[PDB]
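A quick word before the example. In earlier lectures we treated sequence and structure as two separate objects. From today on, think of them as two lines of the same record. Here is DER F 2 written that way.
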Amino acid sequence: DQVDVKDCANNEIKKVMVDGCHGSDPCIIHRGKPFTLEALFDANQNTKTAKIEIKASLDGLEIDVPGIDTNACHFVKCPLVKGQQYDIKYTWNVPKIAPKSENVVVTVKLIGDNGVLACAIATHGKIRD
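And the structure line, produced from the sequence above:
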């Protein structure tokens, strides 16, 4: 079920949803289900390069993107520009995780060289219901 995450790609994304979590409000998520967040988009800018600012924090899964790649390349089709379609992502193997997580926080943003290819932020996020 999609949600209401404040994305900032360009009203061009082809599919941006999140397996349970709730967008906009304090993204509350559920346990026992794969919270594979996502957000696709067809490169419409013009830059073979690319940047990134993703940040997913999970109790036993502290996703993070402090600069792992060198230009949204090791994570996606580096060259976005307006001549390529591609789908970043952040799967989620969900065991049980119990209710409520020690802490959580979702955020994201793709920046080529002309603007922000994509974006997604879940102000606060508590597991449980």
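Notice the following. The chain is about 0% helix and 20% strand. We will return to this example when we discuss secondary structure assignment.
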